[PDB]
Amino acid sequence: HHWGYGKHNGPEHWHKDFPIAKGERQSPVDIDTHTAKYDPSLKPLSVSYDQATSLRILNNGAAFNVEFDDSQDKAVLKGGPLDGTYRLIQFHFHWGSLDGQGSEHTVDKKKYAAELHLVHWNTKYGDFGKAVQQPDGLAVLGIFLKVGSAKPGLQKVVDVLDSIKTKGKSADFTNFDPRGLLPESLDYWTYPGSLTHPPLLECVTWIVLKEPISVSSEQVLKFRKLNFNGEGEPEELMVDNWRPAQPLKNRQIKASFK
Ligand SMILES: [Zn+2]
């Protein structure tokens, strides 16, 4: 049937419906810290989220998305390896059934408990739909989550998950500040890649932060209570919604730090 993260419709099956799954710039990838090249020409990232306007949180059957108003340059990302302004449209997470797995990207083969993806689109293309059809259409900021101390700024998200337990459910989610999810340092790695879930388009400039944020065992546990299924259908817990690392092929990972 349609794609998912199960035994019969998982990542290993995606190529049948989406041939690009075996493409030349697929994500995620393993970041080998010793092979990454320090690039002195990489500018610091510029994250301007002070005017961000969150609108809703939704369970789309693959994860839960926090959507923002992207009709104006309210929350933008620029600098780094980017040319132009990229507007934040939504953020979501990828997590595992156990604390030892869950992230999509890995660092020297190390897996994290979860991975946060803040998705931005290049304003020169007018809208998200047009942007995904361009090689420099999207900029995704990836942040690793490790289990340890609780992250205060994440609790607002955790507490509303009960309201969107099943696929298709959404809830008003206003005044959420994404700055509360950022680590102290903005040092990063960057490489050209793709969406990590269908349609797997190769339109993403990945920016993966080196510093993970810590979340409590209790906070991640609540993520694991969500359902892939819709209301009224057999319960399938939403866990392990991550794609395994793909071949780097002819690509180089650059680092903003040495
Ligand atoms: Zn993602």
From Swiss-Prot:
<protein>
    <recommendedName>
        <fullName>Carbonic anhydrase 2</fullName>
        <ecNumber>4.2.1.1</ecNumber>
        <ecNumber>4.2.1.69</ecNumber>
    </recommendedName>
</protein>
<dbReference type="GO" id="GO:0008270">
    <property type="term" value="F:zinc ion binding"/>
</dbReference>
<dbReference type="GO" id="GO:0045177">
    <property type="term" value="C:apical part of cell"/>
</dbReference>
<dbReference type="GO" id="GO:0018820">
    <property type="term" value="F:cyanamide hydratase activity"/>
</dbReference>
<keyword id="KW-0987">Osteopetrosis</keyword>
<feature type="site" description="Fine-tunes the proton-transfer properties of H-64; involved in the binding of some activators, including histamine and L-histidine">
    <location>
        <position position="60"/>
    </location>
</feature>
<dbReference type="GO" id="GO:2001225">
    <property type="term" value="P:regulation of chloride transport"/>
</dbReference>
<keyword id="KW-0225">Disease variant</keyword>
<keyword id="KW-0963">Cytoplasm</keyword>
<feature type="modified residue" description="Phosphoserine">
    <location>
        <position position="170"/>
    </location>
</feature>
<keyword id="KW-1003">Cell membrane</keyword>
<dbReference type="GO" id="GO:0046903">
    <property type="term" value="P:secretion"/>
</dbReference>
<dbReference type="GO" id="GO:0002009">
    <property type="term" value="P:morphogenesis of an epithelium"/>
</dbReference>
<feature type="modified residue" description="Phosphoserine">
    <location>
        <position position="163"/>
    </location>
</feature>
<dbReference type="GO" id="GO:2001150">
    <property type="term" value="P:positive regulation of dipeptide transmembrane transport"/>
</dbReference>
<dbReference type="GO" id="GO:0004089">
    <property type="term" value="F:carbonate dehydratase activity"/>
</dbReference>
<keyword id="KW-0862">Zinc</keyword>
<feature type="site" description="Fine-tunes the proton-transfer properties of H-64">
    <location>
        <position position="5"/>
    </location>
</feature>
<feature type="binding site">
    <location>
        <position position="92"/>
    </location>
    <ligand>
        <name>Zn(2+)</name>
    </ligand>
</feature>
<feature type="site" description="Involved in the binding of some activators, including histamine and L-histidine">
    <location>
        <position position="90"/>
    </location>
</feature>
<dbReference type="GO" id="GO:0004064">
    <property type="term" value="F:arylesterase activity"/>
</dbReference>
<dbReference type="GO" id="GO:0044070">
    <property type="term" value="P:regulation of monoatomic anion transport"/>
</dbReference>
<dbReference type="GO" id="GO:0043209">
    <property type="term" value="C:myelin sheath"/>
</dbReference>
<keyword id="KW-0597">Phosphoprotein</keyword>
<feature type="site" description="Fine-tunes the proton-transfer properties of H-64; involved in the binding of some activators, including histamine and L-histidine">
    <location>
        <position position="65"/>
    </location>
</feature>
<feature type="domain" description="Alpha-carbonic anhydrase">
    <location>
        <begin position="1"/>
        <end position="257"/>
    </location>
</feature>
<dbReference type="InterPro" id="IPR023561">
    <property type="entry name" value="Carbonic_anhydrase_a-class"/>
</dbReference>
<dbReference type="GO" id="GO:0032849">
    <property type="term" value="P:positive regulation of cellular pH reduction"/>
</dbReference>
<keyword id="KW-0472">Membrane</keyword>
<comment type="subunit">
    <text>Interacts with SLC4A4. Interaction with SLC4A7 regulates SLC4A7 transporter activity. Interacts with SLC26A6 isoform 4 (via C-terminus cytoplasmic domain).</text>
</comment>
<feature type="binding site">
    <location>
        <position position="117"/>
    </location>
    <ligand>
        <name>Zn(2+)</name>
    </ligand>
</feature>
<dbReference type="GO" id="GO:0070062">
    <property type="term" value="C:extracellular exosome"/>
</dbReference>
<feature type="binding site">
    <location>
        <position position="94"/>
    </location>
    <ligand>
        <name>Zn(2+)</name>
    </ligand>
</feature>
<dbReference type="GO" id="GO:0032230">
    <property type="term" value="P:positive regulation of synaptic transmission, GABAergic"/>
</dbReference>
<comment type="similarity">
    <text>Belongs to the alpha-carbonic anhydrase family.</text>
</comment>
<dbReference type="GO" id="GO:0005829">
    <property type="term" value="C:cytosol"/>
</dbReference>
<dbReference type="GO" id="GO:0051453">
    <property type="term" value="P:regulation of intracellular pH"/>
</dbReference>
<dbReference type="InterPro" id="IPR001148">
    <property type="entry name" value="CA_dom"/>
</dbReference>
<dbReference type="InterPro" id="IPR036398">
    <property type="entry name" value="CA_dom_sf"/>
</dbReference>
<dbReference type="InterPro" id="IPR018338">
    <property type="entry name" value="Carbonic_anhydrase_a-class_CS"/>
</dbReference>
<feature type="binding site">
    <location>
        <begin position="196"/>
        <end position="197"/>
    </location>
    <ligand>
        <name>substrate</name>
    </ligand>
</feature>
<dbReference type="Pfam" id="PF00194">
    <property type="entry name" value="Carb_anhydrase"/>
</dbReference>
